[PDB]
Amino acid sequence: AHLTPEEKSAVTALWGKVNVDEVGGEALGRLLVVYPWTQRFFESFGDLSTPDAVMGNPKVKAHGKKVLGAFSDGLAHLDNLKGTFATLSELHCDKLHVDPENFRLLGNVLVCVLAHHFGKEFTPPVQAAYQKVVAGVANALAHKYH
């Protein structure tokens, strides 16, 4: 990986406390609110007009859960992120046409959400370990683009 033992323990520990369903929904909703251009991928999700609409949308909540669950799987294979995300990398490129820059934005919003959710437990060193992961995942997903 990119991560250190101190950093893997850091990552793994915090992740045990995350409610994937809840965090996923928050992370995707915030992406759509903070960087509205990202809404171009979700025209069929319904009302995305205001922050409250975005945040309460069931389809956003559903999708967020899907994304973070896949994200969680990668946490189990921190040593082979590329192998792990190969199929999804190809899917996002070939069928979905998602600019990989979106993976980077989501990673940053996720960090924001963890800090918001965990407060003082989300210390500078823990953040640093999560920044490495998020960058790693984004790189893994962009890997099969062509």
Binding residues for (2R)-2,3-bisphosphoglycerate: 2, 82, 143
Q: How far is CA 82 from CA 19, 107, 135, 142, in A?
A: 25, 16, 12, 9
* Closer of 33 and 81 to other proteins (Cβ): 33
Report, in Å, the least distance between residue 103 CB and other proteins: 11
CA–CA separation, 113 vs 28, rounded Å?
10
Q: Could you say whether residue 80 binds ligand HEM (CB under 6 A)?
A: no
Half-sphere exposure of 66 (CA within 13 A, CB side): 7
The single residue listed with the structure tokens 């406390």 is 17
The two tokens of residue 9 are 């323990």
According to the binding rule CB under 6 A, does residue 67 interact with ligand HEM? Answer: yes
Cβ proximity to ligand HEM: between 10 and 142 the closer is: 142
Name which of other proteins, ligand HEM, none residue 46 binds, using a CB cut-off of 5 to 8 Å depending on partner kind.
none
- Residue number with CB closer to other proteins (73 or 94): 94
Phi-psi category of 119—alpha, beta or left, where left has phi over 0 and alpha has psi -120 to 50? left
Q: Which residues bind ligand HEM (CB under 6 A)?
A: 38, 41, 66-67, 70-71, 88, 91-92, 96, 98, 102-103, 106, 137, 141
